[PDB]
Structure 1
């Protein structure tokens, strides 16, 4: 319901694709990974260049259209699609340049992680990021970004060296340690609040074959496995990463059919370092219970990335400073109640290099909390929403006093209120000052939102 001259100026400056509610590919272009989010934008603007983004930002600003920005569409809160506004869709901006000599990568703001890992691994290089290949680099890096390499090399933001960004006034800025360093501070963990990142520059590291193990323990041996896990990681070397996924056992041939469809602890571990030393380290942590369905391999890092691991999702997540035996029994009891074969209760351990960055150095909070738990409900039948949502919420409720803060990138669509708790008073206020400078009208609000001033 738009101004004809503003539209004509927009389309005149726009070399991407416009998708209207009447167009065929409207219904698919508006779907995101969280299929509980069903929203109808006025327009989807599939940008293909930084000038495209400039045009779309300016057009939304002048039209007063609610702006959703979409990288890979993995927002657990559904932030990358809007009712009645414009989607500034970056999914066609997925170009990457990798320099081996520089050991640097430049990636457009709509890249998927798997394309970035593919390009860097052509030269045996990598930078830390999440564990699922089709996650967008856009939202993930801007919230921090952690995965297999983080204990060794830090968060994705700890390897980011500069961004190209389009601000709410239509300008293009570079942000780095030497240019607009307040903005470069804020985008390292402050989400999409401050503008559209059209390019990320990363330092890369040499990562060769990785020793990897995945196995399944019966919940019978739950208390010993989890306590071994929490105790080992308190003093584990940086090179070891080890994560627990409590879930129904998949009906896979390495597992006895007995265990199929029943709650188990799936344990995944890797050693970022010499595979022969990795074999030693993994063996010392594989035997806290009897491992079933054991898979061991020496993998290219791109294949570790591709290994992990569902239409409707709901998550509740937070950090812990410690995992007591009492919290451990809580996790095991709620895991025993898992109904869907797609649902997981994730237990992750960060720390290491993530924890050695001074807390004030970026906008990412809670570096000093090493534990992360993610109650990730996933299902197919829309008529069962209440039961699955209830499982994640009741599990979070049972763990509440052990949990603090929160990872903005695991928030769900009802968790707008958690933004203050997530960053903490000092950070939130410091960010609120960056927002008043760079987004004073809060044009970019579909995110873990930081209102200006």
Structure 2
């Protein structure tokens, strides 16, 4: 009725979709990345708005405030729980979908760029490349991830040891707050600008665009991928890795992927084969690396190479909006501060990763720049002392095959509890996991006590400052979801 009435006064009607609209199913599904959340049993938005101008976003928020219809914002749609376009329980909401606002304006000489939230990471990276072969930006690894959610929740990838997370390399933003007002760094103040850069999506307003500093990379980088089965000595090698990798020079990141009794060591090095080989021989000879393992290429070519194994298809891999990969998926994460006993590595490789519904485990080492930033300097607290992060990933491809992978995910998380961080058990906000806890709503406001349960896991000692900031910029909890920062007020 009147919410829609208000929208049509301010926004071109071709940018508005109701459930009855012919294109609604298509617009809704276009950036859903998880087949668990696309099916008809999921709660759907009442309306979808696809702005092309910032004034459309402002109008949508004003209308929502006036008619008390809450808005969930979607940029790339990768939210692991789908909270950008679905709710867990029946309720009325509109989705503001930013996929049409996708400009990237790079200033090569100043080494800065303005990037719309609706741009995907691959589009950002590709625009940086068109400006310079020796500039980069340290955000996620997956090209179809949206800038908006990736930066809001922190954002890290293969440059994290060198340059930290995306959010700490953001120098300004353009944001629409809960009253429809347009803000930048100057107008929003220290607290709000601190919170929005890593404090998770949705909670602190709709970010329209981000200004980033662009960072130097050499014209040639080197990648290798070396696998070790357990008979090839994987357990002893990974047991050494967990101590060595966090301490390596910042130019060298060695992550691990495991999906059975075999570990694949994937390395990105900001330099040439010529200097890498002696570094490896000196610091990590157990891996058995030699020049035949090296793949030299530009930074921009390393993005599809690391993620997909592709060397030959830059535009197709980075500029892709077909949305073809739509697994059913479950995810969990952990942080590790103390080395695992060799027996735990034996169990993970020989036992947990050879079970029905077993998934994939990805291990990213910290240390260096990401660990040098104080824990409270940004909302992202997983810094000093971190050896590595773990992501537990489960994919399946048929609707009725969820039981086994969901059970595995729960069981291995229980198994790992004694060896990972605790009090709280830390997790990465952008690896969203609703089983960590969800909000309770009382008198139409999310409660501080329910928020704290999962909030301390994502944000540790930063959670209370996030909530106090929330209370100042959005006391009525307009921008929320089931796992958004609750307001903490007078």
TM-score normalized with structure 1 length: 0.89
Q: Which residue of 1 aligns with 2:405?
A: 388
Q: Which residue of 2 aligns with 1:34?
A: 34
Q: Which residue of 1 aligns with 2:50?
A: 46
Matches within 5 A, 1:88-237: 88-122=96-130, 123-124=132-133, 125-175=135-185, 180-192=189-201, 193-207=203-217, 208-220=219-231, 221-237=233-249
Deviation at 1:191, TM superposition (A): 1.3
Residue 370 and residue 448 in structure 1: after superposition, are their counterparts in 2 closer, same or farther (change >3 A)? farther
Distance 1:315 1:9 in 2: 39
Preserved contact between residue 209 and residue 275 of structure 1 (Cα < 8 Å):
no
Residue 129 and residue 373 in structure 1: after superposition, are their counterparts in 2 closer, same or farther (change >3 A)? same
Matches within 5 A, 1:423-442: 423=458, 426-442=461-477
Deviation at 1:295, TM superposition (A): 5.5
1:79 alignment partner, one of 69, 80, 83: 83
SS in 2 for 1:401: coil
Distance 1:179 1:9 in 2: 27
Preserved contact between residue 319 and residue 373 of structure 1 (Cα < 8 Å):
yes
Q: Which residue of 2 aligns with 1:410?
A: 431
Deviation at 1:218, TM superposition (A): 1.3
Distance 1:334 1:285 in 2: 30
1:358 maps to 2:374: yes
SS in 2 for 1:269: strand
Deviation at 1:60, TM superposition (A): 2.4
Deviation at 1:276, TM superposition (A): 2.6
After superposition, give the CA deviation of every residue in 1:262-308 in whole Å (9 maximum; x if it has no partner).
x532221011234531344356678636789x863112212222231
Preserved contact between residue 322 and residue 371 of structure 1 (Cα < 8 Å):
no
Q: Which residue of 1 aligns with 2:441?
A: none
Q: Which residue of 2 aligns with 1:254?
A: none
Higher deviation after alignment, 184-193 or 440-449: 440-449
1:70 alignment partner, one of 67, 74, 87: 74
Deviation at 1:130, TM superposition (A): 0.9
Unaligned residue ranges in structure 2 (runs of 5+):
309-325, 439-452
Higher deviation after alignment, 225-234 or 183-192: 225-234
1:8 maps to 2:5: yes
Distance 2:247 2:367 in 1: 10
Distance 1:363 1:67 in 2: 23
Residue 219 and residue 49 in structure 1: after superposition, are their counterparts in 2 closer, same or farther (change >3 A)? farther
Higher deviation after alignment, 269-278 or 66-75: 269-278
Deviation at 1:426, TM superposition (A): 3.5
After superposition, give the CA deviation of every residue in 1:218-258 in whole Å (9 maximum; x if it has no partner).
1333212211211221421111101111125xxxxxxxxxx
Deviation at 1:63, TM superposition (A): 2.8
Distance 2:437 2:73 in 1: 17
After superposition, give the CA deviation of every residue in 1:312-360 in whole Å (9 maximum; x if it has no partner).
110111111123224323422454325569x311111122101111222
Deviation at 1:144, TM superposition (A): 1.0
Distance 2:115 2:184 in 1: 14
Preserved contact between residue 117 and residue 210 of structure 2 (Cα < 8 Å):
yes
Residue 420 and residue 204 in structure 1: after superposition, are their counterparts in 2 closer, same or farther (change >3 A)? same
Unaligned residue ranges in structure 1 (runs of 5+):
249-262
Distance 2:104 2:354 in 1: 44
Q: How many equivalent pairs are there? A: 433
Matches within 5 A, 1:331-346: 331-337=348-354, 339=356, 343-346=359-362
SS in 1 for 2:36: coil
SS in 2 for 1:276: helix
Distance 2:333 2:212 in 1: 27
Preserved contact between residue 155 and residue 167 of structure 2 (Cα < 8 Å):
yes
Distance 1:371 1:425 in 2: 17
Distance 2:344 2:57 in 1: 46
Distance 2:129 2:339 in 1: 35
Preserved contact between residue 216 and residue 291 of structure 1 (Cα < 8 Å):
no
Preserved contact between residue 335 and residue 345 of structure 1 (Cα < 8 Å):
no
Distance 2:174 2:51 in 1: 15
Residue 21 and residue 330 in structure 1: after superposition, are their counterparts in 2 closer, same or farther (change >3 A)? same
CA RMSD across the alignment: 2.4
Distance 1:416 1:30 in 2: 26
Deviation at 1:169, TM superposition (A): 0.8
SS in 1 for 2:348: helix
